[PDB]
Amino acid sequence: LRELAGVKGEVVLRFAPNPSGPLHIGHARAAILNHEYARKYDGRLILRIEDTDPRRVDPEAYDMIPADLEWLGVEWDETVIQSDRMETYYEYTEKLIERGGAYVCTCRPEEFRELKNRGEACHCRSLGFRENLQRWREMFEMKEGSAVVRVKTDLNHPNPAIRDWVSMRIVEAEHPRTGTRYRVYPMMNFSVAVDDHLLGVTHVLRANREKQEYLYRHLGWEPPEFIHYGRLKTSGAREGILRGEYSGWDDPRLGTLRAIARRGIRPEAIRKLMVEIGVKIADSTMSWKKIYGLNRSILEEEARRYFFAADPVKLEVVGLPGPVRVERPLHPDHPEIGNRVLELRGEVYLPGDDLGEGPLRLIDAVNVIYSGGELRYHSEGIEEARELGASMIHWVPAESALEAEVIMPDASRVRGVIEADASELEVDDVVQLERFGFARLDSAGPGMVFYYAHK
Ligand SMILES: [Ca+2]
Ligand SMILES: [Zn+2]
């Protein structure tokens, strides 16, 4: 990672998600980068849960988020929850008003906007401290949307959105943590600035900066270093789980860390991806294939190998001279775990998809010809297979085959049979289903269920 600017004394960073649900890949990037810089600079990392929008809080997320961070391997030093800090935001609203940096605006929003867009001040902007403080206190008994606190910025700012932006609003809704205790809530740019300052954040790594600068200015605070990186290319998902067509936060159709973990994607793969992309200023474009590539490099060195025949067809090897005992390593680089032994006696299951007529070599076993729907023995050796132009195919002895299924990344179910040794696997094991893909065992027999990672 590139060096941080203006480092003086201890470095303090934060990761600040909203509790709208568990973490997704986008979150992982901010979490990893901030964690990596805290490690690099021997500094601290603050987890700040930004739950100041009562209608957008998922109660389960408070526990899910730190669990997801642990999964990623992120360590941190303090956990702060914004809904525990309401009186702090109120305190600093009063201070900001006393310093002449904010006012309570009771204008109709559209009438205010018309003035604002022409660089003209509303009457509220001219009120004094005690006048504003009285209006502020009144907000606590007013209706949703009836008054706001606005930060005094520049009414002639080139960017209209930065012109006297809103720091506090009234919302009449039950918060899942604090219930109906509060109706006056901070807007993100206010609570973020106040918390970054009070918690001692030195470097912010993730319009907004420009807005917050006015707050720091008015309060007499030095802002943190701001470092912004390019885009890489939750509420909709939560709705889906509630309605249907998502089984949960770990449904493979979702980009949550939970869903990808369930498929056997390693957190190390995610960390490596985010680190190598770094704090690149320019927009980057990662594909899932990029993540799969990193994961494959990890799994291919250790994942145990088995034959799973999807949509199997049961076929007699007609003319087999006699039984053939086949040995094949569980992993060619790890002799310690030994070899599978497959007993070819008469019938086999072959994967049925795109199974056309012609010569085949059942891996490590025998060469056959499939035609007219019949599988006929040809020979046994590798040279004969080359002479035939036989295509390699995985296979399962019929006598000892086990039922299995694999849930694919679109949540579709692929049914088939797997070789007997697969019964040794336990939930969480991640294996290579040869010539099919890597997959994590999600539930054990009878009837093993795997979740597909990638080819
Ligand atoms: Ca540290
Ligand atoms: Zn006004």
Coordinates of C-alpha atoms and ligand atoms in Angstrom, one line a residue:
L1 CA 0.0 0.0 0.0
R2 CA 1.1 3.6 -0.7
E3 CA 2.3 5.6 2.3
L4 CA -0.2 7.7 4.2
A5 CA 0.3 11.5 4.3
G6 CA 0.7 13.8 7.2
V7 CA 1.4 11.0 9.7
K8 CA 2.2 12.6 13.0
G9 CA 2.0 10.4 16.1
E10 CA -0.4 7.5 16.3
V11 CA -2.4 6.5 13.2
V12 CA -6.2 6.0 13.9
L13 CA -8.5 4.6 11.2
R14 CA -12.1 3.5 11.2
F15 CA -14.4 1.0 9.4
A16 CA -17.9 2.5 9.5
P17 CA -20.7 0.3 8.1
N18 CA -24.4 0.8 8.4
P19 CA -26.4 -2.1 10.0
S20 CA -28.7 -2.6 7.0
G21 CA -27.6 -6.3 6.9
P22 CA -24.3 -8.3 7.0
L23 CA -21.2 -7.3 5.0
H24 CA -20.8 -7.7 1.3
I25 CA -17.7 -7.6 -1.0
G26 CA -17.7 -3.8 -1.1
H27 CA -17.6 -3.6 2.6
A28 CA -14.7 -6.1 2.6
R29 CA -12.5 -3.7 0.7
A30 CA -12.9 -0.8 3.2
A31 CA -12.4 -3.2 6.1
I32 CA -9.3 -4.9 4.7
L33 CA -7.6 -1.6 3.6
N34 CA -8.2 0.1 6.9
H35 CA -7.1 -3.0 8.8
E36 CA -3.9 -3.3 6.6
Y37 CA -3.0 0.4 7.2
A38 CA -3.5 0.0 10.9
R39 CA -1.1 -3.0 10.8
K40 CA 1.4 -1.2 8.6
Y41 CA 1.5 1.9 10.9
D42 CA 1.1 0.1 14.2
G43 CA -2.0 2.2 14.8
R44 CA -5.6 1.5 15.9
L45 CA -8.8 0.6 14.0
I46 CA -12.2 1.7 15.3
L47 CA -15.4 -0.2 14.3
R48 CA -18.2 2.4 14.2
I49 CA -21.7 1.1 13.6
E50 CA -23.5 3.9 11.8
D51 CA -27.1 3.3 12.8
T52 CA -28.7 6.8 12.8
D53 CA -31.4 6.0 10.3
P54 CA -34.1 4.2 12.4
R55 CA -36.0 2.8 9.4
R56 CA -32.9 1.2 7.8
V57 CA -31.7 -0.8 10.7
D58 CA -31.6 -4.6 10.6
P59 CA -31.4 -5.7 14.3
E60 CA -29.5 -8.9 13.3
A61 CA -26.7 -6.9 11.8
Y62 CA -25.2 -5.7 15.1
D63 CA -24.0 -9.2 15.7
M64 CA -23.4 -10.3 12.1
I65 CA -21.0 -7.5 11.2
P66 CA -18.4 -8.2 13.8
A67 CA -18.6 -11.9 13.0
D68 CA -18.0 -11.1 9.3
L69 CA -15.0 -9.0 10.3
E70 CA -13.6 -11.8 12.4
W71 CA -14.0 -14.1 9.4
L72 CA -12.0 -11.7 7.2
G73 CA -9.2 -11.7 9.8
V74 CA -9.7 -8.1 10.7
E75 CA -8.7 -7.1 14.2
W76 CA -9.8 -3.8 15.8
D77 CA -9.4 -1.8 19.0
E78 CA -12.7 -0.1 19.9
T79 CA -16.4 -0.6 19.0
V80 CA -18.7 2.4 19.0
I81 CA -22.4 2.5 18.1
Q82 CA -23.8 5.8 16.9
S83 CA -27.3 5.3 18.4
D84 CA -25.6 5.3 21.9
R85 CA -24.3 8.8 21.1
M86 CA -27.4 10.8 20.5
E87 CA -26.7 13.2 23.4
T88 CA -23.2 13.8 22.0
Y89 CA -24.7 14.9 18.7
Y90 CA -27.1 17.1 20.5
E91 CA -24.3 18.6 22.6
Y92 CA -22.3 19.4 19.5
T93 CA -25.3 20.8 17.7
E94 CA -25.7 23.3 20.5
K95 CA -22.0 24.1 20.4
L96 CA -22.1 24.6 16.7
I97 CA -25.1 26.9 17.0
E98 CA -23.3 28.9 19.8
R99 CA -20.3 29.3 17.5
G100 CA -22.6 30.6 14.8
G101 CA -22.1 27.7 12.5
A102 CA -25.6 26.4 12.2
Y103 CA -29.2 27.4 12.5
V104 CA -32.7 25.9 12.8
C105 CA -34.6 26.4 9.5
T106 CA -38.4 26.2 9.6
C107 CA -38.8 27.2 5.9
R108 CA -40.8 25.0 3.6
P109 CA -38.1 22.9 1.8
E110 CA -39.0 24.0 -1.8
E111 CA -39.1 27.7 -0.8
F112 CA -35.7 27.3 0.9
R113 CA -34.3 25.6 -2.2
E114 CA -35.4 28.4 -4.4
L115 CA -33.5 30.9 -2.2
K116 CA -30.5 28.6 -1.8
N117 CA -30.1 28.1 -5.6
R118 CA -30.0 31.8 -6.1
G119 CA -27.5 32.3 -3.3
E120 CA -30.0 34.1 -1.1
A121 CA -30.4 33.6 2.7
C122 CA -33.6 32.7 4.4
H123 CA -34.7 34.6 7.5
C124 CA -33.6 31.7 9.8
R125 CA -30.0 32.2 8.8
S126 CA -29.9 35.6 10.6
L127 CA -31.2 34.4 14.0
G128 CA -28.9 34.7 17.0
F129 CA -27.7 32.0 19.4
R130 CA -30.6 32.0 21.9
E131 CA -33.2 32.3 19.1
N132 CA -31.7 29.2 17.4
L133 CA -31.3 27.4 20.7
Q134 CA -35.0 27.8 21.4
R135 CA -35.9 26.5 18.0
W136 CA -33.5 23.6 18.5
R137 CA -35.2 22.6 21.7
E138 CA -38.6 22.9 20.1
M139 CA -37.6 20.3 17.4
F140 CA -37.9 17.6 20.0
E141 CA -41.7 18.0 20.0
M142 CA -42.2 18.8 16.3
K143 CA -43.4 16.6 13.6
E144 CA -41.3 14.6 11.1
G145 CA -40.0 16.9 8.3
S146 CA -41.1 20.2 9.9
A147 CA -37.8 21.7 10.7
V148 CA -34.1 20.9 10.2
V149 CA -30.7 22.1 11.5
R150 CA -28.5 23.5 8.6
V151 CA -24.8 24.0 8.7
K152 CA -23.8 27.5 7.6
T153 CA -21.5 27.0 4.6
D154 CA -21.4 29.2 1.4
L155 CA -24.7 30.0 -0.2
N156 CA -22.8 30.7 -3.4
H157 CA -20.9 27.4 -3.5
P158 CA -20.3 26.1 -7.0
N159 CA -21.9 22.8 -5.8
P160 CA -25.5 23.5 -4.7
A161 CA -25.6 20.4 -2.5
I162 CA -22.9 21.8 -0.3
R163 CA -25.0 25.0 0.3
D164 CA -26.2 25.1 4.0
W165 CA -26.6 21.3 4.2
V166 CA -28.8 19.5 6.7
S167 CA -27.1 18.2 9.9
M168 CA -30.2 17.2 11.9
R169 CA -33.7 16.1 11.0
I170 CA -36.9 14.9 12.8
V171 CA -37.9 11.3 12.2
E172 CA -40.9 9.7 13.9
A173 CA -40.1 6.0 13.9
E174 CA -39.2 3.3 16.3
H175 CA -35.4 2.5 16.3
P176 CA -34.7 -1.1 16.9
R177 CA -32.1 -0.3 19.6
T178 CA -33.4 2.9 21.2
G179 CA -37.1 2.4 20.5
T180 CA -39.0 5.7 20.6
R181 CA -36.6 7.6 22.9
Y182 CA -35.4 9.9 20.1
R183 CA -37.0 11.7 17.2
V184 CA -34.2 14.1 16.3
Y185 CA -31.5 12.3 14.3
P186 CA -28.2 13.4 12.8
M187 CA -27.4 13.2 9.1
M188 CA -24.4 11.2 8.1
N189 CA -22.0 14.1 7.4
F190 CA -22.6 15.6 10.8
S191 CA -22.3 12.5 12.9
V192 CA -19.3 11.3 10.9
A193 CA -17.4 14.5 11.4
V194 CA -18.2 14.7 15.1
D195 CA -17.3 11.1 15.7
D196 CA -14.1 11.2 13.6
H197 CA -13.0 14.1 15.7
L198 CA -13.9 12.9 19.1
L199 CA -12.6 9.4 18.5
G200 CA -9.3 10.8 17.2
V201 CA -9.4 9.4 13.7
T202 CA -6.4 10.6 11.8
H203 CA -6.9 9.2 8.3
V204 CA -10.3 8.6 6.6
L205 CA -10.0 5.9 3.9
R206 CA -13.1 4.9 1.9
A207 CA -19.1 15.9 -1.9
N208 CA -18.9 14.5 1.7
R209 CA -15.4 15.8 2.6
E210 CA -16.3 19.2 1.3
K211 CA -19.4 19.3 3.4
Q212 CA -17.7 18.1 6.6
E213 CA -14.8 20.6 6.2
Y214 CA -17.3 23.4 7.2
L215 CA -18.1 21.6 10.4
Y216 CA -14.5 21.2 11.4
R217 CA -13.9 24.8 10.5
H218 CA -16.8 26.1 12.6
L219 CA -15.9 24.0 15.6
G220 CA -12.2 24.9 15.4
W221 CA -11.1 21.4 14.6
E222 CA -8.4 20.1 12.4
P223 CA -9.8 17.6 9.9
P224 CA -8.3 14.1 9.4
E225 CA -6.4 13.3 6.2
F226 CA -8.9 12.2 3.5
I227 CA -8.0 9.4 1.2
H228 CA -10.6 8.4 -1.5
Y229 CA -10.2 5.4 -3.8
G230 CA -11.9 4.3 -7.0
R231 CA -15.0 2.3 -7.3
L232 CA -14.9 -1.5 -7.7
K233 CA -17.5 -3.0 -10.1
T234 CA -28.3 -4.8 0.9
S235 CA -31.8 -3.5 1.4
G236 CA -33.0 -5.2 -1.8
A237 CA -31.6 -8.5 -0.5
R238 CA -33.2 -8.2 2.9
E239 CA -36.5 -7.6 1.2
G240 CA -35.9 -10.7 -0.9
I241 CA -35.2 -12.9 2.1
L242 CA -38.4 -11.7 3.8
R243 CA -40.6 -12.2 0.8
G244 CA -39.0 -15.2 -0.8
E245 CA -36.6 -16.5 -3.4
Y246 CA -33.7 -16.1 -1.0
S247 CA -33.2 -18.7 1.6
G248 CA -31.2 -16.4 3.9
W249 CA -28.2 -14.1 4.0
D250 CA -26.1 -17.1 2.8
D251 CA -28.2 -17.8 -0.3
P252 CA -25.6 -18.3 -3.1
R253 CA -27.3 -15.7 -5.3
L254 CA -26.1 -13.1 -2.9
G255 CA -22.8 -11.2 -2.8
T256 CA -22.6 -11.3 1.0
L257 CA -19.4 -12.6 2.7
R258 CA -21.7 -15.3 4.3
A259 CA -22.9 -16.5 0.9
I260 CA -19.4 -16.7 -0.6
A261 CA -18.0 -18.4 2.6
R262 CA -20.7 -21.0 2.4
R263 CA -19.4 -21.8 -1.2
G264 CA -15.8 -22.3 0.0
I265 CA -14.4 -19.0 -1.0
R266 CA -11.5 -18.3 1.4
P267 CA -11.2 -15.0 3.2
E268 CA -7.4 -14.9 2.3
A269 CA -8.5 -14.7 -1.4
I270 CA -10.6 -11.6 -0.6
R271 CA -7.8 -10.1 1.4
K272 CA -5.3 -10.7 -1.4
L273 CA -7.6 -9.2 -4.0
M274 CA -8.2 -6.0 -2.1
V275 CA -4.5 -5.6 -1.2
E276 CA -3.3 -6.0 -4.7
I277 CA -5.9 -3.5 -6.0
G278 CA -4.8 -1.1 -3.2
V279 CA -6.0 2.5 -2.8
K280 CA -6.0 3.1 -6.6
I281 CA -7.5 6.5 -7.3
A282 CA -8.9 5.5 -10.7
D283 CA -12.0 3.3 -10.9
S284 CA -11.1 -0.4 -11.2
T285 CA -13.2 -3.3 -12.5
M286 CA -13.0 -6.7 -10.8
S287 CA -14.9 -9.8 -11.9
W288 CA -15.9 -12.8 -9.9
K289 CA -13.5 -14.7 -12.1
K290 CA -10.7 -12.6 -10.5
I291 CA -11.8 -13.7 -7.1
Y292 CA -12.1 -17.3 -8.3
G293 CA -8.6 -17.2 -9.7
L294 CA -7.1 -16.3 -6.4
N295 CA -9.3 -18.8 -4.5
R296 CA -8.4 -21.6 -7.0
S297 CA -4.7 -21.0 -6.4
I298 CA -5.4 -21.7 -2.7
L299 CA -7.8 -24.7 -3.1
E300 CA -5.9 -26.5 -5.8
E301 CA -3.0 -27.1 -3.5
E302 CA -4.9 -28.8 -0.7
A303 CA -8.5 -29.7 -1.7
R304 CA -9.2 -33.5 -1.6
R305 CA -10.3 -34.9 -5.0
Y306 CA -13.4 -37.0 -5.7
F307 CA -15.5 -38.1 -8.7
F308 CA -19.0 -36.6 -8.7
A309 CA -21.1 -37.6 -11.7
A310 CA -23.8 -34.9 -12.3
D311 CA -27.0 -36.2 -14.0
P312 CA -25.5 -39.6 -14.1
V313 CA -26.3 -42.4 -16.6
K314 CA -25.9 -45.9 -15.3
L315 CA -24.1 -48.1 -17.8
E316 CA -22.8 -51.6 -17.9
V317 CA -19.2 -51.9 -19.2
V318 CA -20.1 -54.7 -21.7
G319 CA -17.3 -57.1 -22.3
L320 CA -15.2 -56.1 -19.3
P321 CA -12.8 -59.1 -19.0
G322 CA -12.8 -59.0 -15.2
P323 CA -12.7 -56.6 -12.2
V324 CA -10.3 -53.8 -12.2
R325 CA -9.0 -52.1 -9.0
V326 CA -8.2 -48.5 -9.6
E327 CA -6.0 -46.2 -7.4
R328 CA -6.1 -42.5 -7.7
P329 CA -4.5 -39.9 -5.2
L330 CA -6.8 -37.9 -3.1
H331 CA -4.3 -35.1 -3.8
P332 CA -1.2 -35.5 -6.1
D333 CA 0.9 -33.2 -3.9
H334 CA -0.1 -34.8 -0.6
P335 CA 0.7 -38.5 -0.5
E336 CA 0.1 -38.4 3.3
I337 CA -3.6 -38.7 2.7
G338 CA -3.2 -41.6 0.3
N339 CA -5.2 -42.9 -2.6
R340 CA -8.8 -43.6 -3.3
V341 CA -9.5 -47.2 -4.4
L342 CA -12.3 -47.6 -7.0
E343 CA -13.5 -51.1 -7.8
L344 CA -14.7 -51.4 -11.4
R345 CA -16.8 -54.6 -11.5
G346 CA -19.5 -54.2 -14.1
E347 CA -21.7 -51.1 -14.0
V348 CA -20.7 -47.4 -13.7
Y349 CA -22.3 -44.0 -13.5
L350 CA -21.1 -41.5 -16.0
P351 CA -21.9 -37.8 -16.0
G352 CA -24.8 -37.5 -18.5
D353 CA -24.4 -33.9 -19.7
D354 CA -23.0 -33.6 -23.2
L355 CA -22.2 -37.3 -23.2
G356 CA -22.1 -38.2 -26.9
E357 CA -21.0 -41.3 -28.8
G358 CA -17.4 -42.3 -29.2
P359 CA -14.3 -43.5 -27.4
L360 CA -13.9 -42.7 -23.7
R361 CA -11.2 -43.4 -21.1
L362 CA -12.7 -43.8 -17.6
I363 CA -10.0 -42.0 -15.7
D364 CA -7.2 -44.4 -14.4
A365 CA -9.4 -47.4 -15.3
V366 CA -10.3 -48.6 -18.8
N367 CA -11.0 -47.5 -22.4
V368 CA -14.5 -47.9 -23.7
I369 CA -16.7 -47.0 -26.7
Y370 CA -20.1 -45.5 -26.1
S371 CA -22.5 -46.0 -29.1
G372 CA -26.1 -46.9 -29.6
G373 CA -26.6 -46.2 -25.9
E374 CA -24.3 -49.1 -25.0
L375 CA -20.9 -48.9 -23.3
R376 CA -18.5 -51.5 -24.6
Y377 CA -15.0 -52.4 -23.3
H378 CA -12.1 -51.8 -25.6
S379 CA -8.8 -52.0 -23.7
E380 CA -7.1 -50.8 -20.5
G381 CA -3.8 -49.0 -21.3
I382 CA -2.9 -45.4 -21.9
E383 CA -1.3 -46.0 -25.3
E384 CA -4.5 -47.7 -26.5
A385 CA -6.4 -44.7 -25.2
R386 CA -4.2 -42.4 -27.3
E387 CA -4.6 -44.5 -30.3
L388 CA -8.4 -44.3 -30.0
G389 CA -8.3 -40.6 -29.4
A390 CA -10.4 -41.4 -26.3
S391 CA -11.7 -38.5 -24.2
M392 CA -11.1 -38.6 -20.5
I393 CA -14.2 -38.9 -18.3
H394 CA -14.8 -39.2 -14.6
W395 CA -16.9 -42.1 -13.3
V396 CA -18.4 -43.8 -10.2
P397 CA -18.6 -47.6 -9.5
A398 CA -22.3 -48.4 -9.4
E399 CA -22.2 -50.7 -6.4
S400 CA -20.9 -48.2 -3.9
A401 CA -22.1 -44.9 -5.3
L402 CA -23.5 -42.3 -2.9
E403 CA -26.3 -39.8 -3.6
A404 CA -25.1 -36.2 -3.7
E405 CA -26.2 -32.8 -4.9
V406 CA -24.5 -29.5 -5.5
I407 CA -26.1 -26.1 -5.2
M408 CA -24.9 -23.9 -7.9
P409 CA -24.3 -20.1 -7.7
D410 CA -27.7 -19.4 -9.2
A411 CA -29.2 -21.6 -6.4
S412 CA -30.1 -24.4 -8.9
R413 CA -29.7 -27.9 -7.7
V414 CA -27.5 -30.4 -9.6
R415 CA -28.1 -34.0 -8.6
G416 CA -25.8 -37.0 -9.1
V417 CA -23.7 -39.6 -7.4
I418 CA -20.3 -39.4 -5.8
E419 CA -17.6 -42.1 -5.0
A420 CA -17.7 -44.0 -1.7
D421 CA -14.8 -42.2 -0.1
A422 CA -16.7 -38.9 -0.1
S423 CA -18.5 -40.3 3.0
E424 CA -15.3 -39.5 4.9
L425 CA -15.9 -35.7 4.5
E426 CA -17.3 -33.5 7.2
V427 CA -19.3 -30.3 6.9
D428 CA -17.0 -27.4 6.1
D429 CA -14.6 -29.5 4.1
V430 CA -13.8 -28.0 0.7
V431 CA -13.1 -30.4 -2.1
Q432 CA -12.4 -30.7 -5.8
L433 CA -15.1 -32.5 -7.7
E434 CA -12.9 -33.5 -10.5
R435 CA -13.8 -32.1 -14.0
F436 CA -16.7 -30.4 -12.3
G437 CA -15.5 -27.8 -9.8
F438 CA -14.5 -26.9 -6.2
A439 CA -17.2 -27.1 -3.6
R440 CA -17.8 -26.9 0.1
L441 CA -19.7 -29.7 1.9
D442 CA -22.7 -27.9 3.6
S443 CA -24.5 -30.9 5.0
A444 CA -23.5 -34.5 5.4
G445 CA -25.2 -37.7 4.4
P446 CA -27.5 -39.5 3.9
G447 CA -27.5 -37.3 0.8
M448 CA -24.5 -35.0 0.9
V449 CA -25.1 -31.4 -0.2
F450 CA -22.3 -29.3 -1.5
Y451 CA -22.2 -25.6 -2.4
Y452 CA -20.3 -24.8 -5.6
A453 CA -17.4 -22.4 -5.6
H454 CA -16.0 -22.3 -9.1
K455 CA -14.3 -24.4 -11.8
Ligands
CA1 CA -2.7 -2.1 16.2
ZN2 ZN -35.1 29.0 6.8

